[PDB]
RNA sequence: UUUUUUUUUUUUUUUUUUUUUUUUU
RNA sequence: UUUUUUUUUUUUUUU
């Protein structure tokens, strides 16, 4: 790295003024300050900082690659702490440990082999949404042989990892779960806490399951803590997320959250009429953000006595996208809000009601790990409101005009507020946009400016590669829906006749340049450039939706759509029925008539529809 | 002499145009889309037999058809079993040209419905479902 | 189920006693 | 045995009603009592949880018993099809019974027999949930040799179904749907 | 039915009842009773104590 | 005015004016 | 070309 006129950081190559001490032709004692000082001295990985390489242009480690027994976990953790998306990082590391990990079976036939090298390494890799086939097989196999042996605590963590592995089959994973439940049913019924309870349900959410009986029990205990006023805001929001995947349509629970928002808005407004204005949640969250940056700067200066750092908080360990930071919340609830609504029920009490109609058994104890009282933030934040609201929409709660009305109004008030769309994780930004589009005819004032600001930040996050394909697919699919009005224009032949049509609102803030900003490219071309550069990372269901949306903003670029013709032909068999309908619309709208691809797609669609019988004026009669 | 398996009347009007030229298209200009459903309606009789293709994705719009006179069979030769078999082959062969794989089969009678079904399976035109809706009188 | 259980139980005791 | 057991109760299906054994077996002479004693023994016998090998191996063995019982769950029903599958025996070959029989002999199915009485109430056009059984795939009226009904009620049934069609409350060439099985 | 031509202009009554029923019986509560139905209740009247 | 064929991040999306007016690919 | 006959004709359509 000869160029050093733009990155004045510590450790230029390896040593401040040396390169491996000019060793001849062992390499641990004189270089242990490489990883140690690289933990808080390098900006996050992105496109503008290509000089940031894990291997440092093939200089470290590698010329056989050895001597990695010590710095095995440290190295791994580093990668995961900054969201690296470079291919020549993982392949090299894995290979290096080939002789070091396979040789650890001495005592099996000094740390511990599974939970201290395989389980820890897998976790790190998973966070990065990386492909690791070797790790899947080895971990899966081990679980299948010593399942019973493992204790409850170990089982819980083990299962979590597996569940978080899309590579793994869905049939196999499910089976194993049954054993765990059956073995551990009574033990885990009263001696549980919200912190650990959520972990269990996550397994069942990301993977298909039929353990309805078991799920109900867990939820019962959780609601107990809610009535007692012990669940933290972090936990409250977390519970809602999982519910969406499980399609748990709970009335008494959702209603509580609905009313909680109402009181938050009301109380604030009341105090504004007298003179005393309590700080908002939005500002509190951002207030501590500056402190974390202040301490980081002083630490570097003290350690070295002699922009790029934009998204440095979301990549920190322990931060959960869509909720916030774990150690940024305090317990609150019935002690500070409504005390009436959710119906508490305990193990003891449940028994009584079981019979006729007309403390020693159950004991709830939240504080076990650490004291939850940092005098930080209270109540829900601006961004926390959006995430919770999305769940309701999915379930179909907005239909019922009982509670969603007032709730929706509250959000819109704060949404259009000045300086309110710049402090929130990108995960939350996707949910907020859905709320506006889901109810277009039930809003007080058209938030045209809100969409413009939100869209600007969404392109910025996608360019840095800090968003998963699934999270980036909702914003775009839902944007077209918002900018669309159904009308009944007169027919071509008979003017009295009517036919329903679609009209799309024009956009005048997506095609123009941005000379003021560093990125002179527009918001539309930037999305396309990144999509084609990383087409392989996107799945088939995640590719047709993004392409279908680009053509809806009048993108007359036949060359852009001509790159995917070779990619789709070689992967036609892996295409679902929904994928066919989401790809033809795009080419036709842009006036791109392709006969070599459309002829082949006709056969695939008909073959899938070979097992559905539909008759006239009756519908589908026999299916499969 | 100089026999041809087609329609002499239409052959005289030939002017070098490609196939499927007079057939109407859609707004997008595509003759056929990948997402579509077809249901051939076959009607039998004593001498001749007709079988037209109906597209269920275009409000039951006909695309093309064939008859005993479109294969070079005339006079009493139509009554023979070969007349039905030849007609089926033309439909199956022409189906591959358009780009259709699965086509349903519908008929009212069961007299001359054996030669057509056998010919479809000998080229690639499969059968997904069989429909029979005999309109029997409900009064004397 | 009882038969096998009982039998198995005694086998462990004999080996452990030594 | 299966056929002879239907005459005692033609309005219900044969099943192992273990919950109503008191009316047929004396409480003191109940053979099920043995189960109670036996079940307690198995639990008690599991002294190995932590005595000799510890909990390490105890858990493993627990799964074994669950599998065994689940597999053999069909052993408690010789008249059921499960019994035959376990032992792997060929199907029976009953004598060919002629379809054409004199009116004196008739064995209507239990499901349709109860619907005919209709609680001693004649079937009318309002009983839409009962007329759906007396109709074929094409919507034609079944004969008296198929529905197995009396001469008097046969004429009444034909009138109820005929009127329902005139009122646009019954199909004309197919069977009714799940959304139309409700009386007036 | 997919087609938006069916009964639409109507009020849901089923939900109303259910909603009002949560006061007497919470959703998290049990779904079944030990006593059971008529078949179950007969058993308890026949079994004897030790 | 009448609606034809589908799916499941939703109440969603494509088509639309009567057809057919040629064999071997 | 269509219809019809054991076979055929009469009759009907006209870019």
Are D164 and D170 in contact by the 8 Å Cβ rule? The answer is yes
What does the block give as tokens for A298? 């002083």
B65: Cβ under 7 Å from strand G?
A: no
Q: For tokens 């045209």, what's the residue?
A: A448
Q: How far apart are CA A127 and CA A202, in angstroms?
A: 15
End-to-end CA distance of chain C: 27
Q: How far apart are CA A229 and CA D93, in angstroms?
A: 70
Contacts of A52 (CB under 8 A, 6+ apart): A42, A43, A45
Axis crossing angle, helix A119-127 with helix A133-143, rounded to the nearest 10: 130
Q: How far apart are CA D60 and CA A147, in angstroms?
A: 9
- Determine the 3-state secondary structure of B52 from DSSP: strand
With an 8 Å Cβ cutoff, is B32 touching chain A?
Answer: yes
Under an 8 A CB cutoff, do D60 and A149 touch?
yes
- Determine the 3-state secondary structure of A450 from DSSP: helix
Give the number of other Cβ atoms within 10 Å of residue D137's Cβ: 8
Handedness of CA B51, B52, B57, B60 (dihedral sign): negative
Q: Which of A610, A311, A254 is nearest to A463 (CA)?
A: A311
B45: Cβ under 7 Å from strand G?
A: yes
Main-chain phi, psi angles of B139, to 5 degrees: -150, 160
Residues 568-587 of A with CB under 7 A from strand F: 577-578, 581, 585
Q: What totals of helices (H) and strands (E) does chain B contain, helices first? A: 3, 5
Contact residues on chain D for C9, CB-CB shorter than 8 A? 45, 47-48, 52
Residue A585 burial (C-beta neighbours within 10 Å; 0-12, 13-18, 19+): middle
- Determine the 3-state secondary structure of A129 from DSSP: coil
Q: How far apart are CA D10 and CA D109, in angstroms?
A: 8
Q: List the B104-107 sheet strands across, edge first.
A: B61-66, B50-55, B39-43, B104-107, B130-132
Helices (H), A342-489: 347-354, 382-395, 404-415, 426-438, 448-463, 471-482
Q: How far apart are CA B25 and CA A492, in angstroms?
A: 17
* A–E touching, 3+ CB–CB pairs within 8 Å: yes
Q: Which residues pair with A623 in a beta bridge?
A: A612
Q: For tokens 């056969």, what's the residue?
A: A603
Helices (H), A166-229: 170-183, 187-190, 194-206, 212-228
Which own/partner pairs from A482-491 qualify as long-range (CB within 8 Å, at least 24 positions apart)? A482/A433, A482/A436, A482/A437, A482/A440, A482/A451, A483/A507
- Convert chain D into a string of H (helix), E (strand) and C (coil): CCCHHHCCCCCCCCCCCHHHCCCCCCCCCCCCHHHHHHHHHHHHHCCCCCCCCCHHHHHHHHHHHHHHHHHHHHHHCCCCHHHHHHHCCCCCCCCCCCCCCCCCCCCCCHHHHHHHHCCCCCCCCCCHHHHCCCCCCCCCCCCHHHHCCCHHHHHHHHHHHHHHHHCCCCCCCCCCCHHHCCCC
Most B-contacting residue of A583, A599, A606 (CB-CB within 10 A), to test interface: A606
Q: What's the residue count for chain E?
A: 50
Q: How far apart are CA B42 and CA B108, in angstroms?
A: 7
Q: What's the residue count for chain B?
A: 140
Residue D89 burial (C-beta neighbours within 10 Å; 0-12, 13-18, 19+): exposed
Q: For tokens 């859609």, what's the residue?
A: B26
Q: How far apart are CA A43 and CA A464, in angstroms?
A: 12
Are B92 and B125 in contact by the 8 Å Cβ rule? The answer is yes
Q: How far apart are CA A362 and CA A192, in angstroms?
A: 11
Q: Which experimental technique did the depositors report for determining this structure?
A: cryo-EM
Contacts of D80 (CB under 8 A, 6+ apart): D74
Residue nearest to nucleotide F2 (CA to C1'): A497
Give the number of other Cβ atoms within 10 Å of residue A589's Cβ: 16
- Residue B77: DSSP 8-state: G
With an 8 Å Cβ cutoff, is C1 touching chain D?
Answer: yes
B21: Cβ under 7 Å from strand G?
A: no
Which own/partner pairs from E9-16 qualify as long-range (CB within 8 Å, at least 24 positions apart)? E15/A400
From residue A212, how far is each of A238, A248, A458, D31 by CA, in Å? Answer: 20, 10, 38, 36
Under an 8 A CB cutoff, do A148 and D60 touch?
yes
- Over its C-alpha atoms, chain E yields an Rg (Å, rounded) of 20
Q: How far apart are CA A386 and CA A400, in angstroms?
A: 19
With an 8 Å Cβ cutoff, is D81 touching chain C?
Answer: no
Q: How far apart are CA A488 and CA A499, in angstroms?
A: 5
Q: Which residues pair with B102 in a beta bridge?
A: B126
Under an 8 A CB cutoff, do A607 and B32 touch?
no
With an 8 Å Cβ cutoff, is C16 touching chain D?
Answer: yes
Q: How far apart are CA B73 and CA B89, in angstroms?
A: 14
Q: Which residues pair with B126 in a beta bridge?
A: B102
Contacts of A260 (CB under 8 A, 6+ apart): A337, A338, A380
Q: Which residues pair with D30 in a beta bridge?
A: none
Q: Which of A520, A528, A519 is nearest to A546 (CA)?
A: A528
Q: How far apart are CA A96 and CA A116, in angstroms?
A: 17
Q: How far apart are CA A336 and CA A165, in angstroms?
A: 40
Alpha carbon A589 to chain centroid distance? 32
Residue A31 burial (C-beta neighbours within 10 Å; 0-12, 13-18, 19+): middle
Main-chain phi, psi angles of B132, to 5 degrees: -140, 115
From residue A560, how far is each of A17, A535, A541, A551, A565 by CA, in Å? Answer: 48, 13, 19, 10, 10
Q: For tokens 């224009």, what's the residue?
A: A489
Handedness of CA A608, A611, A614, A620 (dihedral sign): negative
Q: How far apart are CA A332 and CA A309, in angstroms?
A: 33
Most B-contacting residue of A491, A577, A602, A615 (CB-CB within 10 A), to test interface: A602
Q: How far apart are CA A136 and CA A155, in angstroms?
A: 17
Exposed e or buried b for every residue in A171-198, given b needs 16+ CB within 10 A? eebeebbebbbebeeeebeeebbbbebb
Residue D101 burial (C-beta neighbours within 10 Å; 0-12, 13-18, 19+): exposed
With an 8 Å Cβ cutoff, is A219 touching chain E?
Answer: yes
Q: How far apart are CA A337 and CA A335, in angstroms?
A: 6
Q: Which residues pair with A498 in a beta bridge?
A: A490
Contacts of B73 (CB under 8 A, 6+ apart): B82, B83, B86
Contacts of B66 (CB under 8 A, 6+ apart): B50, B51, B87, B90, B91, B94
Q: How far apart are CA A401 and CA A399, in angstroms?
A: 6
Q: How far apart are CA A395 and CA A254, in angstroms?
A: 11
Under an 8 A CB cutoff, do A588 and B34 touch?
no
Handedness of CA A298, A303, A309, A314 (dihedral sign): negative
Q: How far apart are CA B25 and CA A222, in angstroms?
A: 61
Q: Which of A234, A163, A154, A241 is nearest to A194 (CA)?
A: A234
Angle at the Cα of E19 (from E15 to E22), degrees rounded to 5?
A: 140
């Amino acid at each position: 790295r000869s160029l050093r006129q733009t990155f004045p950081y510590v450790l230029p190559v390896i040593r401040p003024l040396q390169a491996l001490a000019a060793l001849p032709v062992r390499s641990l004692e004189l270089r242990s300050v490489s990883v140690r000082l690289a933990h808080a001295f390098m900006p996050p990985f992105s496109t503008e900082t290509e000089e940031l390489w894990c291997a440092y242009i093939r200089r470290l480690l590698a010329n056989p690659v050895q001597l990695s027994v010590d710095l095995g976990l440290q190295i791994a953790r580093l990668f995961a702490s900054r969201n690296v998306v470079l291919a020549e990082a993982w392949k090299g590391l894995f290979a290096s440990m080939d002789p070091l990990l396979r040789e650890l079976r001495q005592r099996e036939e000094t740390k511990e082999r599974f939970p201290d090298v395989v389980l820890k390494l897998c976790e790190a890799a998973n966070r990065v949404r990386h492909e690791w086939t070797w790790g899947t097989e080895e971990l899966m196999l081990y679980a299948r042989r010593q399942l019973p042996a493992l204790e409850a605590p170990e089982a819980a963590r083990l299962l979590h990892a597996l569940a978080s592995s899309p590579s793994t089959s869905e049939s196999v994973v499910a089976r194993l779960a049954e054993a765990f439940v059956f073995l551990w049913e009574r033990d885990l019924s009263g001696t549980v806490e919200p912190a650990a309870g959520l972990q269990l349900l996550e397994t069942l959410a990301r993977k298909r399951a039929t353990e309805r009986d078991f799920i109900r029990d867990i939820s019962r205990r959780m609601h107990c803590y809610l009535h007692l006023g012990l669940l933290t805001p972090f936990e409250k929001t977390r519970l809602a997320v999982v519910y969406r995947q499980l399609e748990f349509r709970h009335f008494t629970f959702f209603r509580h959250l609905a009313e909680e928002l109402l009181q938050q808005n009301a109380e604030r407004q009341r105090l504004l009429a007298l003179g005393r204005s309590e700080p908002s949640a939005d500002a509190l969250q951002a207030a501590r953000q500056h402190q974390r940056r202040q301490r980081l700067s002083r630490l570097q200066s003290e350690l070295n006595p002699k922009g790029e750092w934009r998204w440095q908080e979301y990549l920190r360990p322990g931060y959960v996208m869509g909720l916030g930071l774990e150690k940024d919340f305090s317990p609150s609830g019935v002690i500070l809000q409504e005390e009436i609504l959710p119906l508490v029920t305990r193990e003891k009490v449940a028994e009584l009601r079981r019979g006729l109609r007309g403390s020693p058994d159950a004991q709830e104890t939240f504080p076990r790990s650490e004291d939850f009282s940092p005098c930080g933030i209270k109540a829900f934040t601006l961004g926390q409101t959006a995430v919770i609201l999305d769940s309701m929409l999915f379930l179909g709660f907005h239909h019922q005009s009982r509670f969603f009305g007032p709730v929706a109004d509250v959000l819109l008030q704060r949404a259009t507020e000045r300086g309110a769309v710049e402090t929130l994780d990108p995960q939350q930004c996707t949910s907020l946009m859905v709320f506006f589009a889901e109810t277009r005819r039930q809003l007080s004032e058209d938030p045209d400016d809100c969409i413009r600001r939100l869209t600007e930040r969404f392109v910025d996050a996608l360019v840095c590669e800090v968003a998963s394909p699934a999270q980036c697919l909702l914003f775009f699919k839902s944007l077209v829906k918002w900018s669309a009005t159904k009308s009944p224009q007169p027919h071509c032949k008979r003017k009295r006749w009517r036919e329903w049509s679609n009209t799309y609102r024009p956009l005048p803030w997506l095609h123009a340049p941005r000379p003021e900003a560093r990125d002179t490219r527009p918001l539309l071309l930037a999305v396309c450039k990144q999509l084609c550069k990383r087409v392989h990372n996107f799945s088939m269901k995640e590719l047709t939706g993004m392409l279908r949306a680009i053509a809806y903003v009048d993108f007359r670029e036949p060359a852009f759509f001509t790159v995917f013709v070779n990619y789709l032909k070689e992967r036609l068999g892996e295409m679902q029925e929904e994928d066919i309908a989401n790809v033809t619309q795009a080419f036709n709208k842009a006036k791109i008539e392709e006969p070599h691809l459309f002829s082949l797609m006709g056969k695939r669609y008909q073959h899938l529809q070979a097992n559905v019988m539909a008759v006239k004026r009756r519908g589908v009669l026999v299916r499969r | 002499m100089r026999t041809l398996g087609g329609h002499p009347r239409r052959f005289k009007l030939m002017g070098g145009r490609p196939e499927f030229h007079h057939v109407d298209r859609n707004k997008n200009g595509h003759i056929i889309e990948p997402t579509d459903k077809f249901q051939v309606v076959i009607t039998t009789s004593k001498n001749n037999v007709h079988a037209q293709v109906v597209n269920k994705s275009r409000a039951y719009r006909t695309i093309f058809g064939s008859f005993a006179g479109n294969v070079g069979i005339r006079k009493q030769a139509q009554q023979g079993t070969q007349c039905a078999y030849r007609i089926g082959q033309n439909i199956a062969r022409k189906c591959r040209r358009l780009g259709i794989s699965q086509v349903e089969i519908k008929f009212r009678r069961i007299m001359r419905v054996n030669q057509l079904l056998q010919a479809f399976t000998a080229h690639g035109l499969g059968v997904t479902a069989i429909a029979h809706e005999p309109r029997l009188p409900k009064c004397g | 189920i009882r038969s096998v259980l009982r039998r198995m139980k005694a086998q462990a005791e004999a080996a452990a006693q030594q | 045995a299966e056929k002879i057991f239907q005459r005692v109760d033609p309005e219900r299906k044969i099943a192992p009603r273990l919950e109503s054994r008191g009316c047929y077996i004396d409480p003191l002479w109940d053979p099920f009592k043995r189960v109670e004693e036996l079940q307690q023994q198995v639990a008690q016998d599991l002294t190995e949880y932590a005595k000799l090998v510890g909990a390490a191996e105890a858990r493993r063995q627990r799964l074994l018993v669950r599998a065994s019982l689940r597999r053999q769950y069909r052993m408690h029903d010789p008249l059921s099809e499960g019994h035959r599958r376990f032992f792997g025996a060929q199907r029976a070959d009953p004598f060919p019974t002629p379809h054409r029989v004199h009116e004196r002999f008739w064995d209507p199915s239990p499901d349709v027999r109860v619907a005919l009485k209709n609680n001693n109430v004649p079937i009318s056009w309002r009983d839409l949930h009962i007329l759906h059984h007396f109709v074929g795939e094409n919507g034609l009226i079944l004969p008296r040799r198929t529905t197995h009904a009396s001469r008097y009620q046969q004429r009444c049934i034909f009138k109820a179904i005929c009127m329902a069609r005139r009122m646009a409350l019954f199909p004309y060439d197919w069977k009714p749907t799940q959304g139309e099985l409700m009386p007036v | 039915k997919s087609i938006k031509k069916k009964i639409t202009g109507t009020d849901n009554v089923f939900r109303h009842i259910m909603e009002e029923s949560f006061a007497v019986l919470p959703e998290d509560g049990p779904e079944f009773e030990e006593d059971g139905g008529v078949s179950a209740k007969q058993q308890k009247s026949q079994i004897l104590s030790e």
